[PDB]
Design a protein around this nucleic acid. Structure first.
Length: 1227
RNA sequence: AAUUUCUACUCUUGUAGAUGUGAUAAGU
DNA sequence: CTTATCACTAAAAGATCGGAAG
DNA sequence: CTTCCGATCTTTTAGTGATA
């Protein structure tokens, strides 16, 4: 019995609020007089300049330490091979522990505990590892200790400039602890060495050994290219791809040399040699090309290397291009292209579509041309292996121009000669048109973009030829193309820089962190650390103040604020109390002091501690062995239970440690005032983590106390305290609407209900930033014209729960299995509606379908329509592109509220569109997969902690009890099918589909081009007849026919009754007349669509065609043999055109506005479904048709949960299963 | 067209929604 | 342009300065 | 007049659980 309102308080979530600080009183004058802001700006500059020096010393220590490892590597290779062959859990954990011990073994080199080094160098490396992550790297100790590093006097002087202030680097310090650690983190050098580079090197070795087993005739060729490249001259080819040589390959420059050997010098590499071998088309070419024939390069090592401004840069670029005469070289190359041999120069395969998009009319016509011409040149009968050989020989291989000019004819030799005679001419204009004076007028940006794109299209035409010498290419043409390529390669870089400059923003959001000459400013608010951190907050009359007390004449003037009776006028100051993360402080303040470990070496008696204790606390020896053992897993850790299985001694030691913790909690002078009667006794705890997760919320407390106003006023006036007012738009005097969500979090954090029972915790690690001025009347950009102080503070919501969600999917599947009647929301994008919603019931009937064009009754469809018009109205308009892309993000940010409101009201499971396994065209408003990915991520992050503004604080959904329905976001690929209530289903076969019987277009088209193909396609049907009672053409289709021309996705039923409906008038529910069965088809000119749309009436056109042919059909007889006997091309062409028009599900015309669907199949009731009927029980528009089938896919996933005994979904549903399920349920 | 920040407007010197900040790596 | 990491800290420990004593 | 011992400011430091 799990209620939907019980899906709250499951895991903590960390958020961060930001506010603006107004300097109250005359603290602005004090800050300006003392000059903190200029000093902090100079120090931020020094920190930015000092970061690469610390990176340099880390780099040289990493290289020096990695050059000494001689580890042996067969064991992890055996482990990963055992995983590859078995794929069981036992070998999986064996591989995991083998990777862990390899990372530990290589980390022993950094920490200097390696078994295979002597003691002196071990002590040297251990001292270096100790001294890297302390202040000893700043004063100059480890600089002399390393010896290798070279530092000039300026870098050294700015490196010692952080003296007595080193902790400014502290997070950065711990950031570098990510790199050198032995953990499984992706930024670890051991992880990069073991789990990333080594699998690629091992598989490189295996492909090399297998390919040298196949034939050794190219082993000498490998030796010659290794000698000619002059890379790794001290070793042969056989041992450079062996495992022990990886012990020399860990350094970055050796990785670079390995990559240079594999890829060549830009002189051929191994990949180019293999390409030359497989392109020869001898027996060795088939014996190697059927085999794996690639070596993927290794990853780089961590921390390793490899308006007038743009106007002047482009002016110098154009002047240098005019001096080099790149247009003259290009026109000379295009002139000599007309006479040289075309066999010796090749076209890169990556633009095999692109040439089809440029030199001809369709983006894949020349690919089909060369494929069918290779098929026509095949010797013997066509088989599967020969077809696959042809497909392989044309899929990823460069092709010379003679095959292009023979398959596609000589006509391209004119058209190509046309197109270059355009582009270089504009390039000539781009090298003749003068530079614009500024970039503030529209025409200046116009002429600038034209100057970029002509030369950019010239690059994109020069990318056509195969720049890689994978075939036999004469080197002088290669030299000329590469020279003119490298003369003007960076034009893409100036294009990107000009686009991002003209795109970004007109403001300067750059800010630097203020510190007020404090090492640890606003790191914590606790009243014992109130002196050093110097950050407090006051509350008065609903307003919130931040007080920062700086050091006075170089010393912390310990000003004390006195308690005051409440009704006296004054600020309210908190008394923050925290014992941070008791799992790590209870070791810290007991059994890990220097005194206790110094005593426990030479003694066995228990030790009594009486420092910061009200009574002497006793530490016996056994608890010291429990916390500090010989091995890494402690006795009371569950890793000991997993590794050994001795549960009895585990439970006894856990009880002893838990008793010691409970004894400790009552006598430390900070935690003595806390009530611990809320804890269950020691023996009732299953493990240790639950104890710490329940104990941690008990140790944090905020209590307000009244401070006299006069003392604060003289503290501000004197200069001992800097008082700022915390501000956003909700603390203004004219504020009367609903607040922002962060203001709701901030107000609910200091509510009395939260102060009594902590649900939101005010975290430490606050930051103060400063932003310069950035250079009734409503002034544009008021917040961006003045220098401003910002305040960034993190908070932790749902503090009473754990940190990790554990099995969120299991819990939500349990709730969904408990409740079968739960509705399903389906979300789907479309044309003429940006986002479309369909909330359906469990039985399949829709409950509410809507378009999300309108938000606050002032719809965004006209915004996208108008902005997309002005896109065209001024070219592409670099300026407007960004406004469109941000209006899309803002539209999605407003759509988030509508979706979570629908989910909350309907208590439903939402079902989104999976962006993998899918392709979406243009015209869908939001199309870009990155923008919708950002949407799905924003939705997951919003439903991670869902809170509504109008809800009460105490109720579920309020600030003190937010809704948590979705698991924490981790990756765009590790989502799977579900994340809590966020279900994902594959995109296609959801928009163009009959919503009542599930008919889909079974043929694959764009292959109806040859005449006998049309003959076989038309002969595939069973029979066509005419009915005079309804005046319709009934054509019968069997799914076992036209299998070569049908898609390979059979449905449930094999029968279909396609109907050409009488194209008469009809009435909807609203009485608006509409022609029944009419279709919309584009007009085609020069075998290409032109965008203009025309209306088609299939039955009337077929009547006209058949009476013009003189075919008698009023008897109800078959017409297909009555028309195929003449073998007329025009008749079969019109028949195919009418079949395509009839099978066209969607019909839209944005110029006139109508948009509908039309199923050409009679249902079980014999009617033909028309979405222009506007039946509320069926999808209104085509976007509703898409969203309803997305919701039905979610319903299918729900049923897949229901039949399964285990509480887990199936994976992504195959399309054949979806079609079978739909055509089984609906018929 | 006013915003801690973004989007979009002006009955209202503001409105409706969203907003995890800072830092460093790595991939294309 | 994405994917992974870490911090969200008070108290112990040690450097720094100033006063007392031989 | 120099050296040793006590206040003050800065800087390290401890580390729990659980599958995919």
């Amino acid at each position: 019995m799990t209620q939907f309102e019980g899906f709250t308080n499951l895991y903590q979530v960390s958020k961060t609020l930001r506010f603006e600080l107004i300097p109250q009183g005359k603290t602005l004058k004090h800050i300006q007089e003392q000059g903190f802001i200029e000093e902090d700006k100079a120090r931020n500059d020094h920190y930015k300049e000092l970061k690469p020096i610390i990176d340099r010393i880390y780099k040289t220590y990493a290289d020096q330490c990695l050059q000494l490892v001689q580890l042996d590597w067969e064991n992890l290779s055996a482990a990963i091979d055992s995983y590859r062959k078995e794929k069981t859990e036992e070998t999986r954990n064996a591989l995991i522990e083998e990777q862990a011990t390899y990372r530990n073994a290589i980390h022993d080199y950094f920490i200097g505990r390696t078994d295979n080094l002597t003691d002196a160098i071990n002590k040297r490396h251990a001292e270096i590892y100790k001294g890297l992550f302390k202040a000893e790297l700043f004063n100059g100790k480890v600089l002399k200790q390393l010896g290798t590093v070279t530092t000039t006097e300026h870098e050294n002087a700015l490196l010692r400039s952080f003296d007595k202030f080193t902790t400014y680097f502290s997070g950065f310090y711990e950031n570098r602890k990510n790199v050198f650690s032995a953990e499984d983190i992706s930024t670890a050098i051991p992880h990069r060495i073991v789990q990333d580079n080594f699998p690629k090197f091992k598989e490189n070795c295996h492909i090399f050994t297998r390919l040298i087993t196949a034939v050794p005739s190219l082993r000498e060729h490998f030796e010659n290219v290794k000698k000619a490249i002059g890379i790794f001259v001290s070793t042969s080819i056989e041992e450079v791809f062996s495992f022990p040589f990886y012990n020399q390959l860990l350094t970055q420059t050796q990785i670079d040399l390995y990559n240079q050997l594999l890829g060549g010098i830009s002189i051929k590499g191994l990949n180019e040699v293999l390409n030359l071998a497989i392109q020869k088309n001898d027996e060795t070419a088939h014996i190697i090309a059927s085999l794996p024939h690639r070596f993927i390069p290794l990853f780089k090592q961590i921390l390793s290397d490899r308006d007038e401004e743009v106007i002047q840069s482009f002016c110098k670029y154009k002047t240098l291009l005019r001096n080099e005469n790149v247009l003259e070289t290009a026109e000379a190359l295009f002139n000599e292209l007309n006479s040289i041999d075309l066999t010796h120069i090749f076209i890169s395969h990556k633009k095999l579509e692109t040439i089809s998009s440029a030199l001809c009319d369709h983006w894949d016509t020349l690919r089909n041309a060369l494929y069918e011409r290779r098929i026509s040149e095949l010797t013997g009968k066509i088989t599967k292996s020969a077809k696959e050989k042809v497909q392989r020989s044309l899929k990823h291989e460069d092709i010379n121009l003679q095959e292009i000019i023979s398959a596609a004819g000589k006509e391209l030799s004119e058209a190509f000669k046309q197109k270059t005679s355009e582009i270089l001419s504009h390039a000539h204009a781009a090298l003749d048109q003068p530079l614009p004076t500024t970039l503030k007028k529209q025409e200046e940006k116009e002429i600038l973009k034209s100057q970029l794109d002509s030369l950019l299209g010239l690059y994109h035409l020069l990318d056509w030829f195969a720049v890689d010498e994978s075939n036999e290419v004469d080197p002088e043409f290669s030299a000329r193309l590469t020279g003119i390529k490298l003369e003007m390669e960076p034009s893409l870089s100036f294009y990107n820089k000009a686009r991002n400059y003209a795109t970004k923003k007109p403001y300067s959001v750059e800010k630097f962190k203020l510190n007020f000459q404090m090492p640890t400013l606003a790191s914590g608010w606790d009243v014992n650390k109130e002196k050093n951190n110097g950050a407090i907050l006051f509350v008065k009359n609903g307003l919130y103040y931040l007080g920062i007390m700086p050091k006075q004449k170089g010393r912390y003037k310990a000003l004390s604020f006195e308690p005051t009776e409440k009704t006296s006028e004054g600020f309210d100051k908190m008394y923050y109390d925290y014992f941070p993360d008791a799992a790590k402080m209870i070791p810290k303040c007991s059994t890990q002091l220097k005194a206790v470990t110094a005593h426990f070496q030479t003694h066995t008696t228990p030790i009594l501690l009486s420092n910061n204790f009200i009574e002497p606390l006793e530490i016996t020896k056994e608890i010291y062995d429990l916390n500090n053992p010989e091995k890494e897993p402690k006795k009371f850790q569950t890793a000991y239970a997993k590794k050994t299985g001795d549960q009895k001694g585990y439970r006894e030691a856990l009880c002893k440690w838990i008793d010691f913790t409970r004894d400790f909690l009552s006598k430390y002078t900070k935690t003595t005032s806390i009530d611990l009667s809320s804890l269950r006794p020691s023996s009732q705890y299953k493990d240790l983590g639950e104890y710490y997760a329940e104990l941690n919320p008990l140790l944090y407390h905020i209590s307000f106390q009244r401070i006299a106003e006069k003392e604060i006023m003289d503290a501000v006036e004197t200069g001992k305290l800097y008082l700022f007012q915390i501000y956003n738009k909700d603390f203004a005097k004219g504020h009367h609407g609903k607040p922002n969500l962060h203001t709701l979090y901030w107000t609910g954090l200091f509510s009395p209900e939260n102060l009594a029972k902590t649900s939101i915790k005010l975290n430490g690690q606050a930051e103060l930033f400063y932003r310069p001025k950035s250079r009734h009347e409503i002034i544009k950009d008021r917040r961006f014209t003045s220098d401003k102080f910002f305040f960034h503070v993190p908070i932790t919501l749902n503090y009473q729960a754990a940190n990790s969600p554990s099995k969120f999917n299991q819990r939500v599947n349990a709730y969904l299995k408990e409740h079968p009647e739960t509705p399903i929301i389906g979300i789907d994008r479309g044309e003429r509606n940006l986002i479309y919603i369909t909330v359906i019931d469990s039985t399949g009937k829709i409950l509410e379908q809507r378009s999300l064009n309108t938000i606050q009754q002032f719809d965004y469809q006209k915004k996208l329509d108008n902005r997309e018009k002005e896109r065209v109205a001024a070219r592409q308009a670099w300026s407007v592109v960004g406004t469109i892309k941000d209006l899309k993000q803002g539209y999605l940010s407003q759509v988030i509220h509508e979706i979570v409101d629908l989910m909350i009201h309907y208590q439903a499971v939402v079902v989104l569109e999976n962006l993998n396994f899918g392709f979406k065209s243009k015209r869908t408003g939001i199309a870009e997969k990155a923008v919708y990915q950002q949407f799905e991520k924003m939705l997951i992050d919003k439903l991670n902690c869902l809170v509504l503004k109008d809800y009460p604080a105490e109720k579920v959904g309020g600030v003190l009890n937010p809704y948590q329905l979705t698991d924490q976001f981790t990756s765009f690929a590790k989502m799977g099918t579900q994340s809590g209530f966020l279900f994902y289903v594959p995109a296609p076969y959801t928009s163009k589909i009959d919503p009542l019987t599930g008919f889909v277009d079974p043929f694959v088209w764009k292959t109806i081009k040859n005449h006998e193909s049309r003959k076989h396609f038309l002969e595939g049907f069973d029979f066509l007849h005419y009915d005079v009672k309804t005046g319709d053409f009934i054509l019968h289709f069997k799914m076992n026919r036209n299998l070569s021309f049908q898609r390979g996705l059979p449905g449930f039923m094999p029968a279909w009754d396609i109907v050409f409906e009488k194209n008469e008038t009809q009435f909807d529910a609203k009485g608006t007349p509409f022609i029944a069965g009419k279709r919309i088809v584009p007009v085609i000119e020069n075998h290409r669509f032109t965008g203009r749309y025309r209306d088609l009436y299939p039955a009337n056109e077929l009547i006209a065609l058949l009476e013009e042919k003189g075919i008698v059909f009023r008897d109800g007889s078959n017409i297909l043999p009555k028309l195929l006997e003449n073998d007329d091309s025009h008749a079969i062409d019109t028949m195919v055109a009418l079949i395509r028009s009839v099978l066209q599900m969607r019909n839209s015309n944005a110029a006139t506005g109508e948009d509908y669907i039309n199923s050409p199949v009679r249902d079980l009731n014999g009617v033909c479904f028309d979405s222009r009927f506007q039946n509320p029980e069926w999808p209104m528009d085509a976007d509703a048709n898409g969203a309803y089938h997305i919701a039905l896919k979610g319903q299918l996933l729900l049923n897949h949960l229901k039949e399964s005994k285990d509480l887990k979904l199936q994976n992504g549903i195959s399309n054949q299963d979806w079609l079978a399920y739909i055509q089984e349920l609906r018929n």
